Amino acid sequence: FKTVFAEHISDECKRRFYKNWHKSKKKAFTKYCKKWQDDAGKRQLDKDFSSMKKYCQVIRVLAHTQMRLLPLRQKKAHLMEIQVNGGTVAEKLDWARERLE
Amino acid sequence: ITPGTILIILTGRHRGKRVVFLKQLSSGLLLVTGPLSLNRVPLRRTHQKFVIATSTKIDISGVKIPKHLTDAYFKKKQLRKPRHQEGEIFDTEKEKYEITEQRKVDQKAVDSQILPKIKAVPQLQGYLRSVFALTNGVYPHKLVF
Amino acid sequence: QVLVLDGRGHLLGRLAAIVAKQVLLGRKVVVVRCEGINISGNFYRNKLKYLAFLRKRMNTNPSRGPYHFRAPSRIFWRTVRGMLPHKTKRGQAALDRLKVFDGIPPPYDKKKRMVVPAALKVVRLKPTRKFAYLGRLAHEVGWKYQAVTATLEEKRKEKAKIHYRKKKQLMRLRKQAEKNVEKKIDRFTEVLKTHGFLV
Amino acid sequence: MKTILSNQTVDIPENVDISLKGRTVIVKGPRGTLRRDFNHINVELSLLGKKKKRLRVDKWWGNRKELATVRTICSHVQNMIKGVTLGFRYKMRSV
Amino acid sequence: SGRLWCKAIFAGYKRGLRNQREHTALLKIEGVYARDETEFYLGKRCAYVYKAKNNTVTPGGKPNKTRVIWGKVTRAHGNSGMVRAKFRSNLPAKAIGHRIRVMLYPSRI
Amino acid sequence: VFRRFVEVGRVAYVSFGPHAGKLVAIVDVIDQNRALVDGPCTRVRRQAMPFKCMQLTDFILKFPHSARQKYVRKAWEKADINTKWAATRWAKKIEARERKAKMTDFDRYKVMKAKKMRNRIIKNEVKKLQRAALLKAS
RNA sequence: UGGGAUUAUGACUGAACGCCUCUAAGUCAGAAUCCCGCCCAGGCGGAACGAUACGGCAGCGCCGCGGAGCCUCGGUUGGCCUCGGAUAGCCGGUCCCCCGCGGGGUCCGGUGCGGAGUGCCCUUCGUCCUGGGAAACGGGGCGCGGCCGGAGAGGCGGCCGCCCCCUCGCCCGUCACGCACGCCGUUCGUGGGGAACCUGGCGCUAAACCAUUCGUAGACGACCUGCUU
RNA sequence: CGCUGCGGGAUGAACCGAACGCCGGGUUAAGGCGCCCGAUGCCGACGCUCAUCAGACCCCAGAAAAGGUGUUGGUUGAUA
Ligand SMILES: [Mg+2]
Ligand SMILES: [Mg+2]
Ligand SMILES: [Mg+2]
Ligand SMILES: [Mg+2]
Ligand SMILES: [Mg+2]
Ligand SMILES: [Mg+2]
Ligand SMILES: [Mg+2]
Ligand SMILES: [Mg+2]
């Protein structure tokens, strides 16, 4: 139905995009991150969390790993959707909106 | 079809109009005046089979139609042989139709004495300024005319 | 231009036949609320006919075989396909004028819907007989969405009764004004009465 | 064959009051109330008297089987009245 | 300033089951669902209009892209307001389920 | 539940057949689905007619279960059904349903011009009562 | 690894047949069977989000418009909506009571081969001048502002305050409007759909594949990965 | 039949209708008239029948003895 990303997304997560990180310009989420340090974006994003309280039943969260911390040759992170299971929709949005980033 | 009846034309340029019937000539063709003020339709010849008769009538017996009005008078006049027979020509002798005065005189002298009888019926003008057509849910075999 | 049919209280085959004819003749047809459809004969009788169809399948590769649709929408489709030349082109375009749904989606919840009296249950059967609902029957053979589709029709009804009270309010006002200004419209009322309107 | 009419009747005592929305019976009395539907039989139910003294059930133009239902409705009603007026008690023993 | 024609549907050719006689057609008219009410529409001219890639002549106009085939209504195909008709040049078979025009011209009303 | 019965002396209306549009009475019952029938004052001989042909009216008469129809004429004219009958609304709906189909083209025009104005006024009135209620809703 | 409807069977109430009866109407329990679940794959099957090409020439998006030309066909006012019953329904009053001005019920009044009728309803399509009479302030110059839902697949519309502008519906009086000389594809959705030519502002600056490397992968293709920081 | 096509029998050597130059109009036979598929979209008539394997048109492509307070008709003999 709708989705939201945060304001700061480290590069090891952005390498999951960009098959060739070496000769790219790394211009991902550059314009989406400009409606966090803004006035209407604060009105624009927060008009959406209200919808999700009202027209949704299932909440899921995007998370990724920390691959610097390992000995492997790899640097790309792995993404996955995880389900939040609890009481009610409004709770889970508040729980997550705090736990973001 | 009787003198005074009202008729729907449905083929020509003056199409789907409501007119008035005067009489039948000696060639099977009908004389029609959908009076020029209202319908913009003059004295013409029309065919009895490319028309509908309505059940709506008036009394016309007292009226003077001239003698000189004939199939010989409502005749087309073109096809002139004195031509170059060579060029981008051959419909170029003014290319057009222009009205005599005699027609005007005839239309006036008739509608002068037709038209007062029409206004003796109320609302009989809007019926003779309107235009007939078909729409949704109007099947013609059902509707009586 | 476009024809819409509420299927609550109809019979399966008697509806389909009328549809297939119009569809071949250029018309575009839309069948709605296919879970309200009934069938002659009791439940057990009808369940077997469907289960016996589920045991027909190419032994060697049933990735290829008869495809056994479950939903009420797709069953009514699969029926009508039995009444058309679907293995020719004009047959195939006919199918593509038909749209079937289960429940009433948003385009069509604000349109008036037609009925056929010729395929209704109260008309074509005697009341001492048995019949079966196609919604229940799918649930037993693996239709998984009988339960939300219910909630959504409830919400629809909750809003339509709103609309009718407004419409029912306004009729009172339409009727009151008539008897107030009757003295002003007393003339145009008569001619209508003379020619078969308003009497 | 078919026959034109069959009918049968049931009385009510003064203590009890019943009512009907067509083929939906409402009983009430000392020990509470009961509610039961008969919308699957196709009969005509009527209720006549001073404060609805007596009930009759009747049917028109029915076969052998369809006539068999008329007494069965009446039997249920006698049971419901008795229950709301007296109530049922069954005893069971162990062996 | 409006429509002056009745509407119909081209349903198919005269046929048996395993044959055709393509030199006559069948027509389904609107509002007409009984044999008793077809005598109006007898003798009257039909037409099937279509648009082509090239420009063509027009009587009293400029060369638009339209084209026609003319007709004549003949008789009735049985109990239910179906009709038979014939044209000059037999129809194409891509016209099935499309719209033809029934005029009012040979009037006897 | 039921209000109208099939009795001796029950009147009815014929909706389709040779005699459709005509009142008639019932005299005697032959079988499950047929009856002996008469209307003298509507030009309808004595004959048989099924039940699927006719609808039952709320009128009724008084005579025994077979007479010689001089008596039926009395009771008919006695109660003056004909005058009562056109009084009903049911009948006036039939009368009006006639006149619409008989309506010619000039008549069909004058109605157009009238129906128009009638609804201009009624809409323009309804607009006003809404405002009055919206401001008297306080 | 978990459930649902039911078989064979055993029982409830209860007629026909005063009584009796697991059945005629109507109910209950019920299984290595059946269907689904968990589990495998994922449709000529959809969805949400991201970024969108200044190089020695380049190039695109949105808005607003003037002329044209190609190819593919349909069509010839519209109907913006209660739920449901059928051996019964609809409206009004809501006298009387229950659910948070709304809805539910009893009691009343009218209707019912449905006139609060799809056998229906709206909408008028000849234009123009002025010159009298009844009924009257409606709209908008892709106009001035916000409220929303819609969320089942909207691709959707609606109601109060202003800069301005105007006289349309019905009935009569007065004429004009190519009167194109009997005639076929006339008449509207239409600024239609898709490419190519196309006229000013407001905005834009990138990716995939190859070569190369790795081995959680591998017949070759494919797949997992790293390299101006 | 073989030497012989055509309408009907879903299909088909022989079954039913009917035998052939190339075309226009009308009518039929045998079969049939929910949709495939031409035609009942008759306000068709009187009854029977419910099947937890229903029935459905000569040749023809599937079934018997015996049974049943299943239901509708009838005969005979008794009793009120
Ligand atoms: Mg066109
Ligand atoms: Mg179970
Ligand atoms: Mg059992
Ligand atoms: Mg159970
Ligand atoms: Mg021989
Ligand atoms: Mg053959
Ligand atoms: Mg066979
Ligand atoms: Mg056949």
Swiss-Prot record, chain A:
This is Large ribosomal subunit protein uL3. It comes from Oryctolagus cuniculus. It comes from the Eukaryota. Component of the large ribosomal subunit. Interacts with DHX33. Belongs to the universal ribosomal protein uL3 family. It is not required for incorporation of RPL3 into ribosomes. It is found in: Nucleus, Nucleolus; Cytoplasm. The modification N6-acetyllysine is found at K35. Component of the large ribosomal subunit. The ribosome is a large ribonucleoprotein complex responsible for the synthesis of proteins in the cell.
Curated annotation (Swiss-Prot), chain B:
The chain holds residues 147 to 291 of 291 of the full protein. The lineage of its organism: Eukaryota, Metazoa, Chordata, Craniata, Vertebrata. GO terms for cellular component: cytosolic large ribosomal subunit; rough endoplasmic reticulum. Component of the large ribosomal subunit. May bind IPO9 with low affinity. This is Large ribosomal subunit protein eL6. Component of the large ribosomal subunit. The ribosome is a large ribonucleoprotein complex responsible for the synthesis of proteins in the cell. It is found in: Cytoplasm, Cytosol; Cytoplasm; Rough endoplasmic reticulum. Keywords: Acetylation, Cytoplasm, Endoplasmic reticulum, Isopeptide bond, Phosphoprotein, Ribonucleoprotein, Ribosomal protein, Ubl conjugation. GO terms for biological process: cytoplasmic translation; ribosomal large subunit assembly.
Swiss-Prot record, chain D:
One of its GO terms (molecular function) is structural constituent of ribosome. The chain holds residues 1 to 95 of 192 of the full protein. This is Large ribosomal subunit protein uL6. The keyword Cytoplasm applies. Component of the large ribosomal subunit. The ribosome is a large ribonucleoprotein complex responsible for the synthesis of proteins in the cell. The keyword Acetylation applies. Component of the large ribosomal subunit. GO terms for biological process: cytoplasmic translation. Keywords: Acetylation, Cytoplasm, Ribonucleoprotein, Ribosomal protein. Belongs to the universal ribosomal protein uL6 family. Its main location: cytoplasm. It is found in: Cytoplasm. GO terms for cellular component: cytosolic large ribosomal subunit.
UniProtKB/Swiss-Prot annotation, chain F:
The keyword Phosphoprotein applies. The modification Phosphoserine is found at S138. The keyword Transcription does not apply. GO terms for cellular component: cytosolic large ribosomal subunit. There is a cross-link at K123 (Glycyl lysine isopeptide (Lys-Gly) (interchain with G-Cter in SUMO2)). GO terms for biological process: ribosomal large subunit biogenesis; translation. The modification N6-succinyllysine is found at K84. The modification N6-acetyllysine is found at K78, K84. GO terms for molecular function: RNA binding; structural constituent of ribosome. Component of the large ribosomal subunit. The ribosome is a large ribonucleoprotein complex responsible for the synthesis of proteins in the cell. Component of the large ribosomal subunit. This is Large ribosomal subunit protein eL14. It comes from Oryctolagus cuniculus. The lineage of its organism: Eukaryota, Metazoa, Chordata, Craniata, Vertebrata. The gene is RPL14.
